[PDB]
From Swiss-Prot:
Belongs to the protein kinase superfamily. Tyr protein kinase family. JAK subfamily. Tyrosine kinase of the non-receptor type involved in numerous cytokines and interferons signaling, which regulates cell growth, development, cell migration, innate and adaptive immunity. Plays both structural and catalytic roles in numerous interleukins and interferons (IFN-alpha/beta) signaling. Associates with heterodimeric cytokine receptor complexes and activates STAT family members including STAT1, STAT3, STAT4 or STAT6. It comes from Homo sapiens (Human). The chain holds residues 579 to 869 of 1187 of the full protein. This is Non-receptor tyrosine-protein kinase TYK2. Phosphorylated.
């Protein structure tokens, strides 16, 4: 309910960027700010409500590493979330294109930035539910001498609670295992999975596997792979622990990363 209604006349739709979860995403302009326009598919009212819920919740938080949500445009039957365009796009796509050339120090800066934003959300007691490399956007590349990367975590889109089992399974291994059959504990697991994804240059474990085989992995409660670095491995394994209450707080995660 508490979100800004963007007028259709204030937005200009440019190029199609990709399909998202129940969406098509376009570059746009907001009268001018550079934005993305997330056009909801024709949906049951409960999906639209979950879409509105995200826009409302995201409009009331602020963080240097959270992408802005400008509001929602209702254009006839259409529902369009209007969010900040982040210059260099998704981290996973970028890492895959740049693989082999990204130092561990760079990855540790990015990790700390993400842990900072999630520590703030944990404090606000706000569930994200879609922490993954595709949703970490690069505002600054930080490869050049004297530079440092700068990320922004985007909104979760249609809230996890409204999605089907099939699309929850597709979100494995970022999806917390307790969510397969809503606590901020789930974002600790997504963080851990995103750290693995980053360490492996944008390739998450279990992505060459079928949906039924991802589901089976969780049902057997197999442990996800560890990175080579034992301190980093200690943190990822702690985050990627099946019992949610055994996952460390983001205050603790943040402290551990700062020493790395
Ligand atoms: N904030 C942004 N800035 C720049 N490009 C973006 C942004 N958000 C999305 N994109 C682009 O749009 C494409 C589709 O984005 P997705 O994140 O897959 O869509 P989505 O509607 O947010 O669905 P999710 O993340 O499953 S809830 C991405 O591959 C990016 O290239
Ligand atoms: Mg997204």
């Amino acid at each position: 309910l508490s979100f800004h209604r963007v007028d259709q006349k204030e937005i200009t739709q440019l190029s199609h960027l990709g399909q998202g979860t129940r969406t098509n995403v376009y570059e746009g302009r907001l009268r001018e700010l550079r934005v993305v326009l997330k056009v909801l598919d024709p949906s049951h009212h409960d999906i639209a409500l979950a879409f509105y819920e995200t826009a409302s919740l995201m409009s009331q938080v602020s963080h240097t590493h959270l992408a802005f949500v400008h509001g929602v445009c209702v254009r006839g039957p259409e529902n369009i979330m209007v969010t900040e365009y982040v210059e260099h796009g998704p981290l996973d796509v970028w890492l895959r294109r740049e693989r082999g050339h990204v130092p561990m120090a760079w990855k540790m800066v990015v990790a700390q930035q993400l842990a900072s934003a999630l520590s703030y959300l944990e404090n606000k007691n706000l569930v994200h539910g879609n922490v993954c490399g595709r949703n970490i956007l690069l505002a600054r590349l930080g490869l050049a001498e004297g530079t440092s990367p700068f990320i922004k975590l985007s909104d979760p889109g249609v809230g996890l609670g409204a999605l089907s089992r099939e699309e929850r399974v597709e979100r494995i291994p970022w999806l917390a295992p307790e969510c397969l059959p809503l606590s901020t504990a789930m974002d600790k697991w997504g963080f851990g999975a995103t750290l693995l994804e980053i360490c492996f240059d944008g390739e998450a474990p279990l992505q060459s596997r079928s949906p039924s085989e991802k589901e089976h992995f969780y049902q057997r409660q197999h442990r996800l792979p560890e990175p080579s670095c034992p301190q980093l491995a200690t943190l990822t394994s702690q985050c990627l622990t099946y019992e949610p209450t055994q996952r460390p707080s983001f205050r603790t995660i943040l402290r551990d990363l700062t020493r790395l």
